[PDB]
Amino acid sequence: LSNTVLPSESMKVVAESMGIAQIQEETCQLLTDEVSYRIKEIAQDALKFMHMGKRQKLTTSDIDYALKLKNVEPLYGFHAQEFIPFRFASGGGRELYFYEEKEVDLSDIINTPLPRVPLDVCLKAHWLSIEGCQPAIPENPPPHELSVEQQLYYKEITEACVGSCEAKRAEALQSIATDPGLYQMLPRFSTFISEGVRVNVVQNNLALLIYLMRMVKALMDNPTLYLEKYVHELIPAVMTCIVSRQLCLRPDVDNHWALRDFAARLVAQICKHFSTTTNNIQSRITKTFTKSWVDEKTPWTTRYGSIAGLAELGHDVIKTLILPRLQQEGERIRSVLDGPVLSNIDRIGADHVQSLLLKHCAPVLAKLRPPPDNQDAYRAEFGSLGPLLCSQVVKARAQAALQ
Amino acid sequence: RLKPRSIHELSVEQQLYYKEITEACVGSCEAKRAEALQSIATDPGLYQMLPRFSTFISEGVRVNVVQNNLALLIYLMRMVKALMDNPTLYLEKYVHELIPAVMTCIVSRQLCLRPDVDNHWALRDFAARLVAQ
Amino acid sequence: PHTYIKTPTYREPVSDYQVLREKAASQRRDVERALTRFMAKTGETQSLFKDD
Amino acid sequence: WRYGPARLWYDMLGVPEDDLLADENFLMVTQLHWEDDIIWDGEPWYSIFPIDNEDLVYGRWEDNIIWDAQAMPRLLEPPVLTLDPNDENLIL
Numbered sequence: 001l002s003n004t005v006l007p008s009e010s011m012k013v014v015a016e017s018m019g020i021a022q023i024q025e026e027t028c029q030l031l032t033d034e035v036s037y038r039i040k041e042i043a044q045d046a047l048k049f050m051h052m053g054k055r056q057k058l059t060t061s062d063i064d065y066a067l068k069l070k071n072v073e074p075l076y077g078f079h080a081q082e083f084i085p086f087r088f089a090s091g092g093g094r095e096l097y098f099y100e101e102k103e104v105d106l107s108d109i110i111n112t113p114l115p116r117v118p119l120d121v122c123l124k125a126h127w128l129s130i131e132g133c134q135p136a137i138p139e140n141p142p143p144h145e146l147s148v149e150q151q152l153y154y155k156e157i158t159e160a161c162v163g164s165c166e167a168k169r170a171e172a173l174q175s176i177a178t179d180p181g182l183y184q185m186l187p188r189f190s191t192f193i194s195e196g197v198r199v200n201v202v203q204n205n206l207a208l209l210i211y212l213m214r215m216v217k218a219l220m221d222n223p224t225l226y227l228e229k230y231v232h233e234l235i236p237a238v239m240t241c242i243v244s245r246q247l248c249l250r251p252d253v254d255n256h257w258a259l260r261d262f263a264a265r266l267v268a269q270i271c272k273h274f275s276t277t278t279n280n281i282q283s284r285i286t287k288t289f290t291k292s293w294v295d296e297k298t299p300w301t302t303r304y305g306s307i308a309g310l311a312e313l314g315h316d317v318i319k320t321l322i323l324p325r326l327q328q329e330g331e332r333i334r335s336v337l338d339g340p341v342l343s344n345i346d347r348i349g350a351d352h353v354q355s356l357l358l359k360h361c362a363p364v365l366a367k368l369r370p371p372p373d374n375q376d377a378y379r380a381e382f383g384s385l386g387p388l389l390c391s392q393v394v395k396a397r398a399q400a401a402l403q
Numbered sequence: 404r405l406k407p408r409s410i411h412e413l414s415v416e417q418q419l420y421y422k423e424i425t426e427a428c429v430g431s432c433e434a435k436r437a438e439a440l441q442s443i444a445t446d447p448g449l450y451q452m453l454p455r456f457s458t459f460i461s462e463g464v465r466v467n468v469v470q471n472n473l474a475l476l477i478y479l480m481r482m483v484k485a486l487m488d489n490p491t492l493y494l495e496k497y498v499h500e501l502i503p504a505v506m507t508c509i510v511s512r513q514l515c516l517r518p519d520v521d522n523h524w525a526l527r528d529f530a531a532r533l534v535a536q
Numbered sequence: 537p538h539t540y541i542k543t544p545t546y547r548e549p550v551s552d553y554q555v556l557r558e559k560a561a562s563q564r565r566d567v568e569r570a571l572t573r574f575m576a577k578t579g580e581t582q583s584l585f586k587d588d
Numbered sequence: 589w590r591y592g593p594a595r596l597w598y599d600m601l602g603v604p605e606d607d608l609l610a611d612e613n614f615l616m617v618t619q620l621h622w623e624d625d626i627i628w629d630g631e632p633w634y635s636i637f638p639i640d641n642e643d644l645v646y647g648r649w650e651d652n653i654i655w656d657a658q659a660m661p662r663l664l665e666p667p668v669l670t671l672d673p674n675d676e677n678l679i680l
Contacts, residue, residue: 144404144673144680147564153571156578158596171577181566183677188593191669195594199601201654202664228637229675232644236652246657275616277454277497279644283614288650290608302655314619321608404672405680408547409639415543448539458635468629499617503625547638547676560679 005029005036042066150185157185158192161211173214177221189219190230197237206248206256209241213259213266220269228274235281238267242305243292251301252345257352260305261312268312282313290321300349304356311360319364322357329357330381358388365389366396413452421452425459428485430478443485450491456482457497464504471514473523480508480530487534505531592669605666638676 008028015023045066050058060078067074086097126139134140146154159165160172176182182189196212216234219227227234241247241263248254271281286309292298293306310317336350365385369376371393377386411418427439443449460479467476483501487494494501509531513524550556590598590606612618643649654660673680 144671147567149564149568149571153567153574154593156571156574162596165578168578171574175570175574175577179566179570181563181570183563185567187673187675191593192596195597195667198664198667199597201657201660202601204657229641232641232647232649236649239649240653243653243655244657245655276640277457277500277616279640280614280616281644282616282619283611284650286614286619287609288653290613292655294608299656314621316619316621320613320618324608404670406672406674409642409674410544410546411639414538414541415545416541417538417543420538446539455635462632465627465632468627495615495617499615499620499622502617503622506622507626507628556679559677563679 003036005032008032038070042070045069146184146188154185154188157189157215161192161196161215163207163211169211169214173218173221176215176218179222180224182219182222182225186219186225186227186230189215190227190233194233194237197240200240200244200247204244204246204249206254206259209247209263210259213238213241213263216266216270220266220273227270231270231274231281234270235267235285238263238270239285239288242267242309243288243302244305245299245302247301252348256301257304257356260301261308261356264305264309264312267309271313286310286313286317286321293321293325300346300353304349304353307353307356307360311356315363318360322360323364326357326361326385327381329354329361329384333382333384354384358384361385362388362392366392371397413455417448417452418455421449421455424449425456425482428478428482430475430481436478436481440481440485443482444488446489447491449489450493453486453492453494453497456486457500461500461504464507468507468511471511471520473513473515473520473527476508476511476527477523477530480505480527480534483534484530502535505535509535589668589671590666592671594669598666601664603666606668 008025011028011031012023014031015028042063043066046058046062049062049065050056053062055062064074064078085099085101087100088095088097124139126137127135128140129135156168157172157176160169163169193212193215196208200209216238219225242260247256247259267285271285275281289306289309292302293310307322310321332350333354336347336354339347361380362385365376365380366373366389369379369386369389373386373390373393376389377383380386380389413421424439424442427435430436460482463475463479466472467479483505486492509528513520517524589595590603607613
C-alpha cells in the first residue's frame with residue numbers, strides 16, 4: 001500500500017556525522033530511498049535462508065549470509081550474544097540515543113567459569129501415531145458483593161432453575177417462600193429471570209420459561225422480601241412470555257398456550273401487589289395487551305396472550321376491551337371455517353384464540369343477557385359467546401343449588 | 404457502584420405543609436379545619452400532594468370503620484370536598500381510592516348510641532351522598 | 537413561600553451502630569440456616585431424634 | 589458481567605467476552621370494584637414508602653419486550669449488568 005523509508009531528518013544527522021553542515025532536502029530523500037531498498041533486499045535474502053534452514057527467529061547469522069551474498073563487507077560483533085541498549089538525554093533540546101557500553105577487565109572474563117560442553121547431535125525414534133489417534137507418551141504432546149453463604153445458596157438456586165433435578169427446584173421454591181433473609185440476593189434473582197427470557201428469544205424452549213415463572217411466583221409467596229424496587233426488571237420478562245410470537249421451537253407440539261394464561265395471571269398478580277396510582281402499572285399493562293390485540297397482522301399466540309392478560313387483570317377489564325372486539329372474533333371464525341390449507345398452524349392458533357375469547361365472553365354476556373339467553377347468540381358474533389353465556393347461566397344455577 | 408440516593412419529587416417544605424394541612428383537617432379546632440379547606444382551594448402548589456391526601460383520608464376512613472367516629476368522618480368529608488373543588492389537582496386520577504371510602508361512610512353501622520349521634524349520622528349520610536354524585 | 541418553594545433532602549441512612557450490627561447478624565443467620573436446610577432437603581441426612 | 593449474576597445463561601451461550609386506546613378506558617376506577625376494596629370489618633400500610641423506583645416511574649419497559657422473533661432491534665448481546673445496588677435496610 002504505502003512504501004516505508006527511514007526519516008529524512010535521520011539522513012541529515014548522518015550528514016552531520018560526515019561533517020557536511022548543509023544537506024539538500026532532495027539529497028536526504030535520495031539517500032533514504034536507496035538505503036531502505038538495500039535493507040529490504042538484504043531482509044528478503046535473510047528470509048530465504050531462514051525458510052530454507054528452519055529457524056523462524058530471523059537470527060543475525062542469516063543477515064550475515066545475506067551480506068556475503070550481496071558481497072558487501074560483513075558487520076562485526078552481531079554474532080556475539082548482546083542486548084539492545086538505548087540511552088536518551090534531552091540536553092539542549094537535542095534527541096540522541098547511545099549504547100553507553102560498559103568497560104570490563106580482561107582478567108574478569110578469564111575469571112568467569114567455563115560453560116557446559118555442548119552435546120553432539122543424536123537421533124531418537126518414537127511413535128507420533130499408531131494406526132489412529134496419537135498414543136499417550138512423554139515425547140508426544142500432552143494435550144454490591146454476595147456473602148459467601150449467599151453466593152453458595154444462589155449457585156444452588158441456579159442449579160434448581162436448570163431443571164437437572166425437579167425435586168431440588170421444589171425444595172428451593174418452598175425454601176424461598178420460608179426464607180426471611182433473601183436480601184442482597186433479590187437483585188441477583190431478578191437478573192437471572194430476565195437473562196433466561198433473553199436466552200428464550202435466541203433459542204425457544206417452553207420448559208425454561210415455565211421454570212423462571214415458578215421462580216417469580218416463589219418470590220411473590222415470601223412476604224419478607226419486597227419486589228417493589230426490582231419489579232421494573234421483572235415486568236418485561238413476564239410480559240415477553242405472554243406476547244412472544246414463538247414460546248417453543250415447535251408451536252403445535254408444545255402447549256405454549258397453557259403458559260400464556262399462567263404468565264398473564266403472574267403479571268396481574270405482580271402489578272396488583274405493588275400497584276401505585278402515579279406509576280399506573282396496571283394501566284400500562286392493559287394498554288400493551290390492548291395495542292397488540294388491536295394491531296392487525298399480529299401472530300395468534302401474541303393475541304391469545306393479550307386476551308388472557310385482560311381477563312386476568314380484572315372482570316371489568318374484559319368488559320371494556322373484549323366486548324368491542326367481539327366482532328373481530330366472528331371475522332376470525334370465518335378464517336377458521338374456510339382456509340387454503342387445513343393443516344396450517346395459523347388455523348389452530350385462531351381456534352385457541354376462539355376458545356379463550358368465548359370463555360372470557362360468557363361471564364360478561366351472562367351479566368348483560370337474560371338467563372334463557374335466546375337473543376345472546378344473535379348478539380354474539382357467530383353465536384359462540386351466546387352458547388358460552390347459556391352454559392355460564394346453567395353453571396350459575398348449579399352454583400345456586402350447591403349454595 | 405452505589406447510585407446517589409433518590410429524593411422524593413415533592414419538596415420537604417411542601418410535605419411539611421401537607422402535614423400541617425392534614426393536622427388542621429382532623430377537626431380538633433373548627434378554625435384550623437376551615438383555614439385548611441380555604442388553603443387547599445386557593446393553592447395551585449397543593450396539586451401533586453393529592454395521592455398522599457387521598458391515602459391519608461382512606462387510612463382514616465378504614466380505622467373509622469372499625470370504631471365509628473361520625474364527627475371525625477364528617478371532618479374527612481370536608482377535606483374531600485376541599486380537594487375536589489381545587490382545579491389544579493387531577494381528582495379523576497385518584498377518584499378510585501375516594502369512591503369506596505365515601506360509600507362505606509354512608510352505609511356504616513353506628514357503634515355510638517343512635518339517638519345521641521343521630522343528627523351527626525344524618526349529616527354524615529348527606530355529605531357522603533353529595534360527594535358521591 | 538411553599539407554593540414556589542423547592543427543598544431537596546437525601547434519604548437518611550440509619551446512624552445506629554447497634555441496628556447495623558443486628559441487621560448484618562440477622563441476615564447472615566437466616567441465609568446460612570436456609571442453605572443448611574435446603575442442603576438437608578436435597579441430601580441424605582442423619583437425625584438425632586428417631587423419625588425426625 | 590461474564591462471571592456476574594445470570595452467568596449460567598452466559599455460560600450456555602459460551603460467549604468469550606470478559607376508541608379502546610383512550611386513557612379513560614385504562615383508568616383504575618373503570619377496572620376496579622370499589623365495594624370489594626373496603627375491609628368492612630371482615631376477617632394498606634403504603635404511600636409512607638420513602639420513594640418509588642425511578643426507572644418504573646417514567647421508564648418505558650414496553651420497548652424491551654420483543655413482539656416478533658424474526659425482526660429484532662438488537663440480537664443476543666453481552667448485556668453486561670449495571671451492578672448498581674440501592675433499596676433500603678442495606679448494610680452498605
